[PDB]
Amino acid sequence: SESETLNPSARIMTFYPTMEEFRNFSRYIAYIESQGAHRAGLAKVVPPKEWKPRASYDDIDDLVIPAPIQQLVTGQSGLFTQYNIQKKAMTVREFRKIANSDKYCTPRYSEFEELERKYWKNLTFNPPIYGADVNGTLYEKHVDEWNIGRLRTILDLVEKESGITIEGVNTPYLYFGMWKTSFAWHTEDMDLYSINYLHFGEPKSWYSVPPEHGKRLERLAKGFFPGSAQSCEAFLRHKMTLISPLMLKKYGIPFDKVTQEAGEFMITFPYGYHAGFNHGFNCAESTNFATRRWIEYGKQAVLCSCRKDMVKISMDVFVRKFQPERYKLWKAGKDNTVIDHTLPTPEAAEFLK
Ligand SMILES: NCCNC(=O)c1ccnc(-c2cc(C(=O)O)ccn2)c1
Ligand SMILES: [Cl-]
Ligand SMILES: [Cl-]
Ligand SMILES: [Cl-]
Numbered sequence: 001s002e003s004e005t006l007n008p009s010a011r012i013m014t015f016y017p018t019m020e021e022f023r024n025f026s027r028y029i030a031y032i033e034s035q036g037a038h039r040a041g042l043a044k045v046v047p048p049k050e051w052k053p054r055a056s057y058d059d060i061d062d063l064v065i066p067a068p069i070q071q072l073v074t075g076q077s078g079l080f081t082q083y084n085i086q087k088k089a090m091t092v093r094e095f096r097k098i099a100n101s102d103k104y105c106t107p108r109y110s111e112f113e114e115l116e117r118k119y120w121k122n123l124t125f126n127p128p129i130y131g132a133d134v135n136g137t138l139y140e141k142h143v144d145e146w147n148i149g150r151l152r153t154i155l156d157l158v159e160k161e162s163g164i165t166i167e168g169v170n171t172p173y174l175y176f177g178m179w180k181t182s183f184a185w186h187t188e189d190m191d192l193y194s195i196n197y198l199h200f201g202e203p204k205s206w207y208s209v210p211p212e213h214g215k216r217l218e219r220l221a222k223g224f225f226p227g228s229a230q231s232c233e234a235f236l237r238h239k240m241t242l243i244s245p246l247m248l249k250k251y252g253i254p255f256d257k258v259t260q261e262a263g264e265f266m267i268t269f270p271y272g273y274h275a276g277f278n279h280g281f282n283c284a285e286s287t288n289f290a291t292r293r294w295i296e297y298g299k300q301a302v303l304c305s306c307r308k309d310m311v312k313i314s315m316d317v318f319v320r321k322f323q324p325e326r327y328k329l330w331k332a333g334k335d336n337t338v339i340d341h342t343l344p345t346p347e348a349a350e351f352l353k
């Protein structure tokens with residue numbers, strides 16, 4: 001009850017931490033969960049005014065985007081599938097020139113609702129190029145607060161114990177966007193948390209479905225794409241499936257929307273389905289992270305069964321370390337723990353006493 005009493009509408013919450021609160025990353029995540037933020041699947045955190053991860057973005061035009069993606073989208077009536085066409089490597093300068101050309105630039109509009117309508121109307125036309133999945137960080141080597149390259153959560157246990165790195169998951173990715181570039185409906189690999197910082201440029205808009213209603217979204221998607229569902233136990237993980245908010249509304253799927261501006265963080269939570277699009281030229285940085293609450297999600301995540309090189313993290317070391325009394329039962333396939341999506345991570349205890 002107690003946890004199910006906080007953020008009962010499961011709406012997207014927005015936080016404005018002081019510099020003092022801001023400093024301890026995992027602690028602040030535990031705090032925002034004590035306020036019910038995770039129930040939405042997504043939350044915005046606006047960093048203290050005097051915080052900056054970089055002095056200047058003037059020196060990056062020569063940065064290479066090795067695998068720009070042209071996003072072809074096919075579909076109608078609010079349901080689309082996106083196909084990636086990889087283009088030749090190009091520099092940020094070359095990307096921005098294209099993003100801003102008349103051909104690819106943001107269309108005119110007054111209110112967000114209008115840009116949003118244009119997005120869903122023109123999604124299948126004039127396929128844009130997304131400078132996605134660029135290995136690297138734009139953080140200055142000395143920034144200690146919310147440094148996407150070193151958040152210091154328990155996800156570090158993966159590399160620490162095995163030496164394994166998974167690009168964009170326990171290392172940072174940069175995303176250079178232009179108008180109408182998209183991210184399909186998905187939860188994170190292994191149902192992890194993610195953090196996304198918009199370094200600069202035009203806004204990135206998001207949609208989110210509360211984890212407690214995640215299964216309803218999957219049921220709907222299966223119905224809409226039965227062929228894909230037959231071929232894979234988790235086809236949404238291909239990140240190719242776009243579904244408009246009008247379709248979600250028409251089929252009773254709860255969801256919220258939020259627009260992220262330059263200088264703002266978005267946090268997605270385990271099993272929070274999210275999707276969205278960029279307004280124009282921008283650059284975001286992101287990676288995954290964990291809390292103790294994630295471990296159970298990791299154990300129960302339903303993974304892509306059809307592709308080679310899909311992301312899978314061995315849960316063994318987390319279960320041994322944080323759930324030793326359940327280890328044997330788990331290895332014996334008898335762990336029937338049921339996840340309660342409303343419960344905050346146990347590190348939040350101190351904010352709840
Ligand atoms: N292409 C393979 C590598 N992994 C992914 O595509 C992936 C995984 C999880 N989240 C995302 C994601 C992207 C964005 C963005 O493009 O702003 C926003 C929110 N989530 C992307
Ligand atoms: Cl706040
Ligand atoms: Cl299908
Ligand atoms: Cl795709």
Ligand SMILES: [Cl-]
Pocket residue numbers: 190234237302303304305310311312
């Ligand atoms: Cl998977």
Ligand code: NA
Pocket residue numbers: 133167
């Ligand atoms: Na890569």
Ligand code: NI
Pocket residue numbers: 186187188194268274
């Ligand atoms: Ni994501």
Ligand SMILES: [Zn+2]
Pocket residue numbers: 231232233234235238304305306307
């Ligand atoms: Zn698959």
